[PDB]
Design a protein around this motif. Sequence first.
Motif, short mmCIF file in Angstrom:
data_model
loop_
_atom_site.label_atom_id
_atom_site.label_comp_id
_atom_site.label_asym_id
_atom_site.label_seq_id
_atom_site.Cartn_x
_atom_site.Cartn_y
_atom_site.Cartn_z
N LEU A 62 0.84 -1.22 0.00
CA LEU A 62 0.00 0.00 0.00
C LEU A 62 0.87 1.25 0.00
N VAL A 63 1.94 1.28 0.80
CA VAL A 63 2.78 2.50 0.95
C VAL A 63 3.41 2.82 -0.40
N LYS A 64 3.86 1.81 -1.13
CA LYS A 64 4.50 2.06 -2.44
C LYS A 64 3.45 2.67 -3.36
N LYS A 65 3.80 3.73 -4.09
CA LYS A 65 2.92 4.42 -5.08
C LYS A 65 2.16 5.53 -4.38
N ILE A 66 2.11 5.54 -3.05
CA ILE A 66 1.59 6.72 -2.30
C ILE A 66 2.62 7.80 -2.59
N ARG A 67 3.89 7.41 -2.60
CA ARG A 67 5.02 8.36 -2.73
C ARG A 67 5.21 8.82 -4.17
N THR A 68 4.98 7.95 -5.16
CA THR A 68 5.24 8.27 -6.58
C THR A 68 4.15 9.22 -7.08
N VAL A 69 2.90 8.93 -6.76
CA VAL A 69 1.75 9.76 -7.20
C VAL A 69 1.93 11.13 -6.56
N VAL A 70 2.36 11.17 -5.29
CA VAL A 70 2.62 12.45 -4.57
C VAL A 70 3.76 13.18 -5.27
N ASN A 71 4.81 12.46 -5.66
CA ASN A 71 5.98 13.06 -6.36
C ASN A 71 5.55 13.62 -7.72
N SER A 72 4.68 12.93 -8.46
CA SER A 72 4.20 13.37 -9.80
C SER A 72 3.45 14.68 -9.65
N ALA A 73 2.66 14.83 -8.59
CA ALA A 73 1.93 16.05 -8.30
C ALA A 73 2.88 17.20 -8.02
N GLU A 74 3.83 17.00 -7.11
CA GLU A 74 4.79 18.06 -6.79
C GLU A 74 5.42 18.61 -8.06
N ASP A 75 5.82 17.71 -8.96
CA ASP A 75 6.50 18.12 -10.18
C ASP A 75 5.59 18.98 -11.04
N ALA A 76 4.35 18.52 -11.26
CA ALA A 76 3.44 19.27 -12.12
C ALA A 76 3.14 20.65 -11.54
N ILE A 77 2.89 20.73 -10.23
CA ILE A 77 2.57 22.03 -9.64
C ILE A 77 3.76 22.98 -9.77
N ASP A 78 4.97 22.51 -9.48
CA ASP A 78 6.11 23.42 -9.54
C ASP A 78 6.36 23.89 -10.97
N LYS A 79 6.25 22.99 -11.95
CA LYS A 79 6.43 23.41 -13.33
C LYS A 79 5.38 24.44 -13.72
N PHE A 80 4.12 24.22 -13.32
CA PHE A 80 3.08 25.21 -13.57
C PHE A 80 3.43 26.55 -12.96
N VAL A 81 3.88 26.55 -11.70
CA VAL A 81 4.12 27.81 -11.01
C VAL A 81 5.20 28.60 -11.72
N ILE A 82 6.30 27.93 -12.07
CA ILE A 82 7.39 28.64 -12.73
C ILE A 82 6.93 29.14 -14.10
N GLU A 83 6.11 28.35 -14.80
CA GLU A 83 5.62 28.76 -16.11
C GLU A 83 4.75 30.01 -16.00
#
Lengths: 885, 885
Positions: A62-83
Amino acid sequence: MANVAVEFLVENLMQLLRDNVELISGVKEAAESLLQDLNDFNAFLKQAAKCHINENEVLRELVKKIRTVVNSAEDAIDKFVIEAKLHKDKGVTRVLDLPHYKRVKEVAGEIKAIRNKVREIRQTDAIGLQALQDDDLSARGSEERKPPVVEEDDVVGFDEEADIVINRLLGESNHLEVVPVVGMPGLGKTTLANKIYKHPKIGYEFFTRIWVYVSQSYRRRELFLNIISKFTRNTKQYHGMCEEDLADEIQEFLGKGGKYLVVLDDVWSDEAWERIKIAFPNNNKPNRVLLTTRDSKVAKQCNPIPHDLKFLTEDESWILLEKKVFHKDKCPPELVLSGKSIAKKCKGLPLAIVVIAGALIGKGKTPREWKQVDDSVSEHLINRDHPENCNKLVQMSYDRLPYDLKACFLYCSAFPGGFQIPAWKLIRLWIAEGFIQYKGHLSLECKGEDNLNDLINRNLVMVMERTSDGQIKTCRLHDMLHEFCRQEAMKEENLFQEIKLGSEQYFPGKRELSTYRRLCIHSSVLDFFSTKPSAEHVRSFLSFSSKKIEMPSADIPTIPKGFPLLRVLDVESINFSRFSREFYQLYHLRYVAFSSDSIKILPKLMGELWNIQTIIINTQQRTLDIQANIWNMERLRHLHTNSSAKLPVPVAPKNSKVTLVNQSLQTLSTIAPESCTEEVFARTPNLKKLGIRGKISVLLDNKSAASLKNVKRLEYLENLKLINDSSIQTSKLRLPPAYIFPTKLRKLTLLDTWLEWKDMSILGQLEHLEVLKMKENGFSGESWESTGGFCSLLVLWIERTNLVSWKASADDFPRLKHLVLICCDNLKEVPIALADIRSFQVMMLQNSTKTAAISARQIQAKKDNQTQQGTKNIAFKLSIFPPDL
Amino acid sequence: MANVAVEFLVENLMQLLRDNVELISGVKEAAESLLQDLNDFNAFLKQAAKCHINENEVLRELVKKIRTVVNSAEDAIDKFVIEAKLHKDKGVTRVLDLPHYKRVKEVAGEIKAIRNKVREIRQTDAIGLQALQDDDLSARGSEERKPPVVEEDDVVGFDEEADIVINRLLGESNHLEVVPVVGMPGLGKTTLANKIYKHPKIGYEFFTRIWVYVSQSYRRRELFLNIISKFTRNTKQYHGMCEEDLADEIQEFLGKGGKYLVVLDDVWSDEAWERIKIAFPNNNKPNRVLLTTRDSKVAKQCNPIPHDLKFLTEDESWILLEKKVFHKDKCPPELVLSGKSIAKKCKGLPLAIVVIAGALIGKGKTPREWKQVDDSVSEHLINRDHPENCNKLVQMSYDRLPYDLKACFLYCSAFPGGFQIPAWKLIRLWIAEGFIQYKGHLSLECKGEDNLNDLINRNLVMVMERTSDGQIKTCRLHDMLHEFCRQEAMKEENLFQEIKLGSEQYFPGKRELSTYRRLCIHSSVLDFFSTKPSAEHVRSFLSFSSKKIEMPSADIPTIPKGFPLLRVLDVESINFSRFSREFYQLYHLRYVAFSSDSIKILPKLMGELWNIQTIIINTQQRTLDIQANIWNMERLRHLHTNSSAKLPVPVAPKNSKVTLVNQSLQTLSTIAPESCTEEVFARTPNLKKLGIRGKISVLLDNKSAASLKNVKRLEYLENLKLINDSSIQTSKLRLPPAYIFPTKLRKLTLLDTWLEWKDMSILGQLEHLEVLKMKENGFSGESWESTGGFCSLLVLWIERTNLVSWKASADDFPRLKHLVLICCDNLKEVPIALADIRSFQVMMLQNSTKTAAISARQIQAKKDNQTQQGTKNIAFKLSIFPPDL
Ligand SMILES: O=P(O)(O)O[C@H]1[C@@H](OP(=O)(O)O)[C@@H](OP(=O)(O)O)[C@@H](OP(=O)(O)O)[C@@H](OP(=O)(O)O)[C@@H]1OP(=O)(O)O
Ligand SMILES: O=P(O)(O)O[C@H]1[C@H](OP(=O)(O)O)[C@@H](OP(=O)(O)O)[C@H](OP(=O)(O)O)[C@@H](OP(=O)(O)O)[C@H]1OP(=O)(O)O
Ligand SMILES: Nc1ncnc2c1ncn2[C@@H]1O[C@H](COP(=O)(O)OP(=O)(O)O)[C@@H](O)[C@H]1O
Ligand SMILES: Nc1ncnc2c1ncn2[C@@H]1O[C@H](COP(=O)(O)OP(=O)(O)O)[C@@H](O)[C@H]1O
């Protein structure tokens, strides 16, 4: 732990939503959705933590992929913000910014797919939440922890090797001999060698005594420069001389100073000794060298008779564990059999026993915990010779740490082996990485200091240096702990990855470097940056080198363009000549340190990085001019500097009612006196440390600015420093009355004010001041007579003065503990009334007249009789610089 | 102690020198001399405090004649300040203005003669230091004290008299009979009577039950207004009635509620009972009333058989001592003999034992202390029945208190006997009197609360009511403690002086009043002010009446002109028509409370008082308009109000860079919604409590919701209150999202917002909120279904709503402790899943449907079964106010 990343993402998203509505405006619904889902995720990971996840496979799945989906979100939000901030720079006043709004909305399409993914996974998580909440363990409250005052400085059952070694040395006249010591890691060769280097007989015998640490990653010339430094003031001249000549100069200086004892620590390769020995002159004197080690071959080579170290017997073991777990108090009887069984389980290794005492402190002092720990040890030390037994023991200790300290310990393993960690930097890095989160009322720095003290208490991190104040100034990690932590971080958690290059290897390719979150490069760095790397998902970048490397003019753009999503950037060991625009386009930068030699102006674009917390700058020019609106940067908390900083002239908004007063601002390391104005201090209410470099005269004069009077406004100010850079006595300087200073001021420093000794009454009037440090002829004169007032002063420090006559009474300094008298080669005697104060414990007297030394020995004899007289006095320790006196 | 006065003068002079340079420009030299001298005397008196002072006459002579000097200096300085500030208002731009600055400079001549006298004392006091260096006692460190959770709620060994009396009552049904109890003061008549009044059988038997404390100082008409208030919702009808008709109406209402048990406490005079009794309708019911008293005569008058109370035996004595001193732990064996010897010496008095246990907590837990206190208690209880035997024991306990707590404990006797002290006001008074000096990092309010907890722990102060969240709400002192404190203050320390108009006390003349420093008039005060008193040296003035008294139009000048040097002024019991022009020249005023009924504007002259800390205004108007520059007054810490306050519009200085941001401001009781703005919230950073009374529509309107969005900026905000005055549900209102609210918010109150129950999801998201109170139809609806989120909610309070259906699961409220459900007249079910929450412990349910009561009884049965099952559950207490539900 996944909790750390989850919490950090939640906090950053909340801060961005509250603070800056426009950037996020196109996707507000997705931001709020992710916020709710991340809160729920965090609750679920806490509930999972309550269980033993490793016991069930499904929980671990269960713990595995909680971290990857969370990581994918962080990336998209930061790229949006800088853009979108780049869009703000574009200044497209079009209602429908169709061109490239569809790029920020491509990032938004990724955001929307990510929100859909997070909405999913959350439904599966809801399944199995009730089953997980059926189970719990370790249901208990939180208790307080207490500061780590010195304890058990004495070394149990090691006088034997100490005396053998101290005996062996001084055998053959006119021979340069070396004393090897061996013994498996964690046995205590460094501890015993320290006990030698600090034994009174050794200091009596040899005049010059140098402590030198030589690891495997040691460098020869870096060492020679520092050892020459032991003798003289400046090494910048020998930055430009050869190692051989440098070896020759050390030889001359070392031979001049009579005998010499030199300590080189933890040698690894015999050729290391072969190379290092050259500097030592074998000038036909009884000079003794003391090297320790782990390998037998090198010890045998450097001398056919190595002294092997010994294990602690069972009784020494039990006493040591008792001391560490119970400190000064004695063990209650019920746990005695448990503790003795564990001590026996240890086999007499000081390291295993020490870490086990740490684990016992962590668990508690109840019989069930002791029996469980006994069973676990009786299981994890079936072998002896295998080091991984120590690793198993440390893992057992580690499992009980809070997850917050779990992050900090690993992150403390980031630094290179043998590097001595500057505590203030370590705390600020912890803050910028988000490992310390708001809880309660303590300032973040205080919480970090408490965390470091906690980590020291359970014996995971060994302290190296301490301050005058009694606080910690530099720590590190023992080799075994470093190895265990580094493996655990780089393999399991992927906290960071290191890029040290072995022979016949290549720096990874873009596909590999794709899966990193943090980099550490402590070896050839210009070589990695000549390749022009690119990894879009690197958030930190650390390089804690030894030398200072210049950055080629054609290579500056690589860091900003290679890693456009940085948060932390510590390259203090890399010198920049300038900066490129992509640098000012780094909008997530929280922590930024760098050095320089030609920088004089801090460009104004730098004030557009609206998340900066910390700034550290090194510059060779005396004056650093700052043009960035540090009044605009809301979250700024520290501004360090080594030159004299000229802050900008503050202005309040004209068309905006809002006032620019930073609540969270704790430092201004060195500002010019010219800016010590009313407005500069009106904007920094919570300021806790201020320093002023320049011409202190402008302050003290009452014409230009009543600057010292302006200082009255900082209610919480607790540390001040007056640094004068004028070298010319143009006039005499006078301190204003003692009702101008703040009330809590606890530590003051003067340097080249050149004040008259009569003014010391003003400082005596101050109430809480606990440390006074005047260096390089701060107060000029020949006649000071104590007049009372220093009620709480704890350490007195006098250096490079022409004082001659000093006179006082034992009621002048009631709480004195420490007294430092450096480079006072014109004082005659110290008043003997200082021998009456009970708390007076430590004294030192460097490069001082011998009559002062005779008086100091008188004072020591006096306190010795006092302690003999049945009084409960704290032990007495003296220090006189002359080997003869 | 003289120390407190010394410190307060030093602090005030320091602040005057720092801030207002011009006022003290003409005398700053004498001022600085005096400042250093006062520091020196503070140290001197500390050293004197080390050596025993009570026993030595020489010390008690030396300390005298220092206080006279400091008082003379204070008066001279204050007269100077007032006259010089009037000079500022004169606006004399003359370089040399002799008139009224010659008399002011000869006030400075008085200042100069006083500084000369202080210098003489300085020379004299230095003589006599040699003895002080010899002697010092009680040299030890300071430890922490812990918050007062309930200890020994159960009464040791009192159950038997409770049995006798509960058995004794109800014997002759259909009759109004009084039950007297007698037993010397400090024996526990009210403790036992409370235990009875909270015994389940009593509540089961009689429906209505009333608690009415009585005393010699009782007032009948107030008693009835209070007795009828307990039954009624509106007292307006009975306010203008006659006392006899008050009796009639209480008769009718008491008859309405079937049976009734009425408790009247500490009756002193038979005339009192005879005068009171008429209101009780002897309506031929099995009704009961319970009297307790210290006197036999009146007890006999009321009924020929009073049940005399007993003393605790030796076993009960020692049990009570161990309970009080050790709370839930068990005494170490060595102290058992000492504790039992003390308990036996105590004769069985619960009060003596309680006070001795307090003294033992104060001293320590070591055998030397126990032997000392034993040998002293044997000495001070030689006689038995006599009261002074108790006073001496209090002296023993009180001696060990810190000199800071001695002032507060004495100051708690200022309030008239039989008055329940509002804790928040008490703390604010302590702050304004200078009793609490900034020590450490705690906020002044927190330090005061800790001091009050400490005083409660030693059993010197009895708590009366607690809040919802467990904190203290009102307290008082037991009679004997009050008498001891009153004598100690009025006679030895001259802390204050009372003027109680006995049948033969008549107001002192101007000479006698020339010696007071503080007044308390808790009797006819208009009579004292008809005389037009005059006392330049009165600094405080207190009048804590129970009624409200209106001030005649011809006497409004009397307070200011009579006492032109006031600092504290609490006359909240005196209604003012208006203020005369001298109120605006009380430039020393720190604490100022008052009431009014026609006030609508705080005239701008009020802002001229630069030292105000606290302001309390109790006006009957619905809106209060403020025109005084709150942003100008720099030390303002609190502002309390009743009407929707309309603060002034902030402005920054045009020609000055200064910013008007108050760091100290910490309260705004009820601001108008219209003023909630980023301009205001920018100025109040550390604000911790905010309230908004008015038309909550402007706030909660999503279109204009920028108001609560502004509320987002207060980082430390910890309490918020939304109060609506409009009685018209003009539209529906929706909370903004849960990322706008601060993160630390702990307590929320709503009143007549009329919000849909679906919005409770927003409040669920808040993490730290611990108490939710919705009153008077806050949330409107018929169907609420819990959706999780209230992670740390401890108390739930629902009042006056038309909710019918509620649905939840035991995972909705993991940490609930107390659930309050009043006037929910349309609820039908209380989800049973609330019986699965371990934290849930106390429940209440008032004016609710019967089905809810049935469900609650099932819940109690469930939790009883659980606690029976071996689980370690905190015991369960259920309460339904109407027993027949
Ligand atoms: O402070 P408490 O002792 O808890 O009193 C609270 C509350 O106070 P806070 O919310 O500020 O803490 C109010 O008292 P004030 O603030 O007005 O002084 C008042 O309710 P209102 O908001 O409607 O004024 C009410 O006290 P009371 O029952 O005397 O009206 C209530 O009582 P609780 O103590 O039960 O919470
Ligand atoms: O021993 P410390 O307690 O650390 O005090 C000072 C001080 O440190 P803190 O202000 O943080 O207490 C200085 O710190 P920085 O200037 O680097 O910020 C440091 O440098 P200065 O000389 O400029 O004061 C100085 O180290 P040093 O004097 O050796 O250069 C050091 O005192 P120490 O001598 O004990 O390190
Ligand atoms: N004689 C001893 N008694 C107690 N603790 C010891 C002793 N010798 C070493 N230690 C512990 O071992 C650690 C020191 O590491 P050390 O063994 O000196 O490294 P190495 O021997 O590998 O150079 C410290 O935690 C110290 O407390
Ligand atoms: N067994 C006991 N009986 C009576 N009072 C007790 C007992 N144990 C502790 N006390 C404490 O003693 C204090 C004084 O008693 P109190 O009831 O005020 O005196 P009285 O009722 O005679 O006026 C109370 O606050 C109570 O908490």
